[PDB]
Design an enzyme around this catalytic site. Sequence first.
Site, short mmCIF file in Angstrom:
data_model
loop_
_atom_site.label_atom_id
_atom_site.label_comp_id
_atom_site.label_asym_id
_atom_site.label_seq_id
_atom_site.Cartn_x
_atom_site.Cartn_y
_atom_site.Cartn_z
N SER A 83 2.45 6.85 -9.28
CA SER A 83 2.53 7.39 -8.18
C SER A 83 1.21 8.39 -7.77
O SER A 83 0.77 9.11 -7.85
CB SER A 83 3.50 7.55 -6.74
OG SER A 83 4.17 6.25 -6.29
N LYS A 137 -1.70 8.80 -6.87
CA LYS A 137 -1.69 9.33 -5.69
C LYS A 137 -2.93 11.19 -5.80
O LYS A 137 -3.45 10.70 -4.80
CB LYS A 137 -0.62 9.24 -4.57
CG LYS A 137 -0.09 7.98 -4.55
CD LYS A 137 1.10 8.18 -4.57
CE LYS A 137 2.06 6.84 -3.43
NZ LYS A 137 2.49 6.39 -4.53
N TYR A 146 7.68 9.88 2.44
CA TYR A 146 6.52 9.31 0.78
C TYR A 146 6.39 8.07 1.31
O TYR A 146 7.44 6.85 1.46
CB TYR A 146 7.88 9.97 -0.05
CG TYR A 146 6.69 9.42 -1.67
CD1 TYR A 146 5.49 9.89 -1.92
CD2 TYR A 146 6.18 8.34 -2.18
CE1 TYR A 146 5.03 10.39 -3.29
CE2 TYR A 146 6.13 7.91 -3.29
CZ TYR A 146 4.87 8.82 -3.68
OH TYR A 146 4.41 8.99 -4.63
N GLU A 173 2.63 18.83 -4.53
CA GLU A 173 3.96 19.10 -4.06
C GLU A 173 4.56 20.22 -4.50
O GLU A 173 3.37 20.94 -6.27
CB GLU A 173 5.18 18.20 -4.44
CG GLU A 173 5.02 17.11 -3.82
CD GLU A 173 6.18 15.55 -3.87
OE1 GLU A 173 6.51 15.86 -4.68
OE2 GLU A 173 5.34 14.26 -3.69
N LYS A 199 3.72 16.39 -9.69
CA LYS A 199 3.77 15.30 -8.63
C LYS A 199 4.09 14.51 -10.27
O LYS A 199 4.27 14.19 -10.99
CB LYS A 199 2.29 14.61 -8.79
CG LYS A 199 2.21 13.08 -8.17
CD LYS A 199 2.47 13.71 -6.59
CE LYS A 199 3.24 11.59 -5.78
NZ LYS A 199 4.40 11.45 -6.06
N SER A 241 6.31 6.82 -11.20
CA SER A 241 6.67 5.69 -11.73
C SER A 241 6.22 4.12 -11.89
O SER A 241 5.25 3.79 -10.88
CB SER A 241 7.86 5.60 -11.24
OG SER A 241 8.54 7.21 -11.77
#
Length: 360
Positions: free
Chosen positions: A58, A61, A144, A266, A309, A312
Site C-alpha cells: 500500500s 498508493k 480504508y 496520513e 504511510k 504491506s
Amino acid sequence: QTREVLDPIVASLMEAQQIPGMAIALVRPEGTTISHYGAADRETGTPVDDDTLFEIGSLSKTLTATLASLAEVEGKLDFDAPVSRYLPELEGSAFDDISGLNLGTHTGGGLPLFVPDEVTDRASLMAWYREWQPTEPIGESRTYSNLGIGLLGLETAASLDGEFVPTMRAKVLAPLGMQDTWYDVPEARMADYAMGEDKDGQPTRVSPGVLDDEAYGIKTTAADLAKLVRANLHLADVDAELQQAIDATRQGHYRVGDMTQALIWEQYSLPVAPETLRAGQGYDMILEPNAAEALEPPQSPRDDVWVNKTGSTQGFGGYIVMLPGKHTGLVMLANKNYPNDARVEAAYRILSGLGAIDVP
Ligand SMILES: [Ca+2]
Ligand SMILES: [Ca+2]
Ligand SMILES: [Ca+2]
Ligand SMILES: [Ca+2]
Ligand SMILES: [Cs+]
C-alpha cells in the site's frame, strides 16, 4: 554518525521481528543516507544491496495519489467532480455522487477494503462499481479502501488519456529519477527481487490481481522511495508542476479523530505520542469506518506534523515517515510483514535518536 543511531535500532528490530533484510533511507538537509541490512532472500542468503527490490504494498498508493494530483495541476482532473464525469461507463451509479477527492481520502461512501472475488477483470470491476450501494455517508466517513484508491487510479488514467503504468512512469517516476521502481519486475531484474517472508516464516511473493498497480503493486528500492520523500520535503529539483502536485498530496482534507487524512498520506500534529501513531495503524482505524470531518479550508500543507504511510504484502512491510518542519524523512523497507506497532516504534526511536523529535 546517522549510522551510529540507526544501526543498533535496526539490528535490534531485525532480531526481535526476525526480518531477513531491510533497506533504509534517511533523508535530511545535508543529504540522503541509504543503508542495507541482512539478506534479500533468507533461503539463498543473497545480501540486500543498492539494487534489491522490495514489495511496498500500500505504499504504492502514494504514487497513485501523486499522479492524481498532477492530473489536477495540469487541469485535466477536477478532484471534487463526480468520478462518472471521467468514467462515463459509471454514469447513473453512486459515482455520480463520489469524487476523486473522496477516493483519495477513503471517504467514498464506505467503498470496501478488498476487491471482491467475483471481480476478475476490468469489465467485471466496472459492473461491480455500477451496482454497488454506498453504506456510509459520502464525505463523512473513512474506510480504508483498495477499491477506492484503485478507482482513483482508473479515473486519473482516463483524465490523462493514457494507460496507468506507462503514464505513471513518464509523468512521475522518470522525472523523480525513480528508475528502479517497477509494477512488473523485468526478467533482467528478477535476481534483484527480494523474497518475502510471511508471519509464519514461509517464503512468499505477491500475486497479480485486479487493481494491483493502482493499489499495491510497486516493487522498488529504498533509494527510489527516498526521491519521492525528498521532493515532498522540498529538497529535490523537480519540474514546477510536479512539485505542485506533490505538495498538494499533503493538503489536509479530513479530520478523523486524532489523524488528518491528506491525499493518501496520513498525518498528526506535533508533538505526537507513539500510542496515537499506533492507533492509526490498528484495527479500529484500518478495519472499521471512522467519522471524518471535511476541512474545506483545505488545510495548506503543514510544517509541524508527522506525515506517514504504512504498506504491506504477505511477505513485506514498509513504512514512510516525513517531518516537513525538520526537512527529514525516513523510509524503512523489510522483506517480512512485521507488526505496524514495531514499525512505529522503530521509526520514532530513529527520529528521536537523530534529534528530529523529542520524547515526553
Ligand atoms: Ca471543482
Ligand atoms: Ca479475494
Ligand atoms: Ca494490473
Ligand atoms: Ca517497546
Ligand atoms: Cs524503471
